Structure formats: structure tokens, C-alpha cells
Amino acid sequence: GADREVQRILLELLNQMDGFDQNVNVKVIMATNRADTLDPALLRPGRLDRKIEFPLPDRRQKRLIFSTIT
Amino acid sequence: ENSEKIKVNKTLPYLVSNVIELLDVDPNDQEEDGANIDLDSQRKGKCAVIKTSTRQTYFLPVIGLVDAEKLKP
Amino acid sequence: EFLHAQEEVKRIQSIPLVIGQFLEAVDQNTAIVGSTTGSNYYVRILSTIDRELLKPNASVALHKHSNALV
Amino acid sequence: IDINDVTPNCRVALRNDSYTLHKILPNKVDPLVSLMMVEKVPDSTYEMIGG
Amino acid sequence: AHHTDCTFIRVSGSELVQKFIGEGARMVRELFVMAREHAPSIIFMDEIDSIGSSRLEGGSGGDSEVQRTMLELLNQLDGFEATKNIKVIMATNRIDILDSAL
Amino acid sequence: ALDMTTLTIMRYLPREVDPLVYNMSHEDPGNVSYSEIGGLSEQIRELR
Amino acid sequence: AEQVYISSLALLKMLKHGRAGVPMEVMGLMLGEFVDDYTVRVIDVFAMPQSGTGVSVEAVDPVFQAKMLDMLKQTGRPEMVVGWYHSHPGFGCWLSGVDINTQQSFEALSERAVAVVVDPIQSVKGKVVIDAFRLINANMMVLLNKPSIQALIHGLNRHYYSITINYRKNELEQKMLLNLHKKYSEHCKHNESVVKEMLELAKNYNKAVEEEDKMTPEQLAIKNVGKQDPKRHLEEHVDVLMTSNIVQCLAA
């Protein structure tokens, strides 16, 4: 529907990353729920590299959970 | 003396406004901000509010010139 | 006499004061600032304060009527 | 200053009660597209990767 | 582009089209004029294969279609001049992303 | 509370959000009966 | 014109009371003496009742002023009221339509009265911001074209005319002041000061050495390139450090 209003916001995040992270002391962590429509240069390295996705559980993992609640 | 006084403000341009909250205890509230970069909206209003149409909110203590119970939120 | 003059200047502007945020230093005692009213001006600044230890992200107090960085 | 002295797309100072150009500042660009990334220096070379 | 001593201009195809009225049609044409002032230049059509620095590998009808347009602008150019300095770079993996016109 | 040209703090008051009656419309819990269109009873018991 | 003379003590009295008043209006009465209409002396002033609504023409309280005068008279310092003060804190030094009306009531009573205004919120500059006012009352407001002017001053009355603010010093009050500093208690205070520094020196030394080590590689690096505002700062810093060590030395 739009891509302008949001644009100035997006530029600033790129500016900040570049402003710091050579005397790293602050971390940036992202969460998504609709990661089917990210920006290409939100992903360009030097801005993001690890992508951790949620998995299916192991039999042994289910058990642990069960042991705690009971 | 009072009658002339009130009359002058009526002759237009005049501000009509909308009372959002009736209430008449717990003053203070908040509107507007500073700047720099990163965008999330905020708005507030309490005691009694009128929001005038330049989009400004105002804190007034009640008068008997019109009765507040007769007024609504 | 030199001392006496130096006293006067700090007085001339005092509180309340308006806030702006520094865009850039154009040159010696000139700067482009963007006020948080969102009106940008080209302004005078008084010589009593460092001019390259001022951050490009630093919020600054400028006078309202004269628009000079206090 | 005269009009030959200006070159389009300059940031400038205009007075507010006389509305003449006091000075001209430096220059300024514009993103018309929603993603501008131009590289005039590279991220690769011959020995960027081998083989 | 570095060796050639020109600008690397990556244009992402799908970023050229807007749900805003008329802005997309103006955008493809508008770019060519810019390059000429910038000349010499490299136009890489980005988003039709990448390393994976930038989303999407492949696409027709709006990565090829905008690119096709470029081929036609150039055909006229070739008739009205005889020395160029505008190169087009296409990248693909697929041979099946290629239209009959291509 | 601030003034409008002196721009000073007239008062301080503790931060709660403003209450909502312009966003809280009241429906009293007994303008009806649960024997009026009762016999829907069983679903009432599970919600209870 | 006119010159009102404000007492040495008087200015300080005025400032304290108004500051407490902030940002509401405060008025009081001024006492002193008249010689001719050329000179106005203000010896003393007293405050009257406070108002959050603002001063008014009917805001005068007869009992209060009457009563106080008797008590002052008893102390051996009676005088008449030479005029009145009213405050404007940032409401402009220029008097309002309301204040002129107020001002007229007093002048009905007097033959001439002064209005002294202080802006107490603009008094936190660090030097005085005081204004003195009167009405436009001809005599020597008559002192573009030449028939035009005299008539204009005549025709229209009750326009804003600020006048000169002055003082006269007094030798005893001047001396008192000098004593209130000293580079009874002071005798001890000086001696003490010398002592205390010596004990601490061990710590002071360590901080003083630290600053110097940081500062040096910097000036070298900066040597290459143009200058910038930290190089200077760094140089200046070291100069002061050294001065402080002498005083420690001086104490023994």
C-alpha cells in the first residue's frame, strides 16, 4: 500500500549500524513473524548474518518439559 | 460589565471544541514531543479536556457559566 | 576590562530555551541546524564552546527569538 | 551573487524578511527510488575469490 | 566495473514499480537520462540472479520485462549515435527464464 | 501543568493513564435474565 | 526629566520578595522622600497582601498599610508613600491597560507617584533588570515638524514613559560586603585549608600523573594533520595541573 512513510525509518537503522559496531558494546536482535517480505539490503552482510529459525522437538526434548511440569 | 466581555469572543473567527473527558479531579496530562530520529505516536488528555481544532488540548477548571453535569464526555 | 566583557555574554540568553538538533557546521561560527519544530535555519553560534567535539547527533538548545545555539 | 554563480540543486540560505540569497551552501542528492545503493568503488577484485 | 573505471549501478527491477499512480512508468525511462550525465556507467540488472546479498534469484515479466525495455531504448540509441559507454549486465542461472524476444 | 508563556511547572501530579468512559460504555449485568433465552444453559455452565 | 534614587539595601529587598512571588504579580508600597519633583529618594518599601489573580485597583487593604506605618513610626523611621511597585515577570516591561488604570487611582491621591517594575524572572541574568515608569504628563515631554509635536504631547496623555533608575552608595554598607568573603571562623578556616591538602597528596599525585600519560601520544598524532579542538584542550589541561601542585607545595 505505501513504501515512503516507512522509508525514513528504514534509512536510519542502516545509518546507526554504520555509526557504531567498531567499539561494539550494544547488540541488536531482530524478531519477525512475516519474514516473507524483508528488504534485500536488510540482509546484505554487515547488517545481519545469523538467522535462527524455530524447529521440531526431539523425543528427549519433549520429555524434559514433561518432567518439569509433573 | 460581564455581559459585554463574553459577547466579543463569540463574534467569529471563534473556536468550537469538543470535550473528551468530563472529570474535575487529577489534573495534568501530556501532548507533543521533541525530535531526532525513530517514530511512534503518543497522545493523552485528562481532568477536563477540550481539544480545539488546531489539534491542541486544554486543561480548564469548571465554571457555572454552563454546568458540567449538563456537559458530557 | 577583558574579563568584564566575558561575564556579559553568558547572561544574554538564559532559560527558558528552545531545543533544536545540530545538522552540520557550515563553516567558522556558522552552522545549519534543524529545529525540532521542524524548521531548519542557518545560524550563528557564540565562541565560548568547542566546535568539533559537538556530535552530529547532539541535541542543542538554541534561543527562540534569535535562533542562535546557546 | 548572480544567477551564473548558482548551479541547480544547491542548498542555499534565503532571508526571511527580504527574501534574497544570502549564501549558497554545498550540494545535495535525492533518492527517487526506494532503494539506492551505488558502488563507485568495488567489493571484488581478481583475487576476490580464486579459481 | 572497478577495472573499467566506471560507476557500478545496480537497479533492482521490482523496486521500479509502484502502486502509486504513474510513478512506475516514469521510473524506467527516467533512469536512462541519469546514466548519460553519469557516463560511463554499468547498468547491472539486479534481482534476476545475485550471490545472495540481495533477495531473489531469477524472474521474468518484471525483471526481464523492465530489462527488455532497456534493450529497446538502446536500439534507438544505436541509430542516433555510434559510440556507446553504457553496458548492460544480465545475470542468470536458468536458460528458461529467457523470452523469445530475449 | 505548565503555563502558556511563563513556561514553568505549576504543578506535579502522579502518572496514571486517564480513565475511559468515552471508551468505556456500560452495560449493566442484569438488564436481562439467564432464564429468558435460557436453555442455552449448558454452554453458560462451561463458560462459568 | 526625573531621577529616582533607589537605596543600596533597597534593591536586594525588592529582589527577594518578588522571586518568592514568581510568576504571580507582587506589589508593595514605596517609602522615601520627595525634594522638588526632580529627585525621588526610596529609603524603604514594604509588601502588602498577595494575590494569585493579579493586582487590582481595589486590591488595596487600608488596615494593613495604616497599621504597618504606625509600627514603623514607632521604630523611628516614618515617611510618606512616594509611589508603588508592581511586578511583570516576562509579561514585558511595558505596562498593561489594566495597570494604567491602577496607576491613575494612586496619582488621583498623589500629585505624582512612580511605578517601579522589576522582572524577577529576567533578574536571573546576573545583572540588574529594573524599569521605572510614569505617565506622559507633559512639562518636559514637550521639551517631525515643530507645531506638530507640542500639541501631540498635550492632546494625548497616559502613554508609557520609562525614566532613569539610579542609586547612591553608602560607605558603611560598601565596607560590610568586602568582609563577606576573605581569600572569627576565617582565622581557623585558612589555617585548616593549608593542612588538609597535604594528607590527600598521596591520592592527588596518582590522578595528576594519569592525565599526563593519555595526553602525550595525542599531540604527536595531531602534529601531522591540521588542528582540532581536543589538541588545544589537552594542552591547556596540563597547564592547570601544575599550578595546583604549587599550592600543595606552598602549604609547608
Short mmCIF file of C-alpha atoms in Angstrom, two decimals, chain C residues 8 11-12 14 49-53, chain G residues 124-127 227-230 233:
data_model
loop_
_atom_site.label_atom_id
_atom_site.label_comp_id
_atom_site.label_asym_id
_atom_site.label_seq_id
_atom_site.Cartn_x
_atom_site.Cartn_y
_atom_site.Cartn_z
CA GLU C 8 28.11 39.68 29.96
CA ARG C 11 23.83 36.14 30.60
CA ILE C 12 22.35 37.44 27.35
CA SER C 14 19.14 32.40 29.55
CA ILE C 49 32.39 26.30 23.18
CA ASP C 50 34.15 23.61 21.15
CA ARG C 51 33.02 23.28 17.56
CA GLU C 52 34.33 19.73 16.53
CA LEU C 53 33.59 17.96 19.81
CA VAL G 124 18.36 35.71 36.83
CA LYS G 125 20.67 37.12 34.14
CA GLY G 126 23.20 38.10 36.75
CA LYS G 127 22.93 41.80 36.43
CA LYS G 227 44.45 21.15 14.20
CA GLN G 228 41.26 20.39 16.09
CA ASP G 229 39.59 21.46 19.23
CA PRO G 230 40.84 18.50 21.55
CA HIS G 233 42.11 21.36 25.32
#
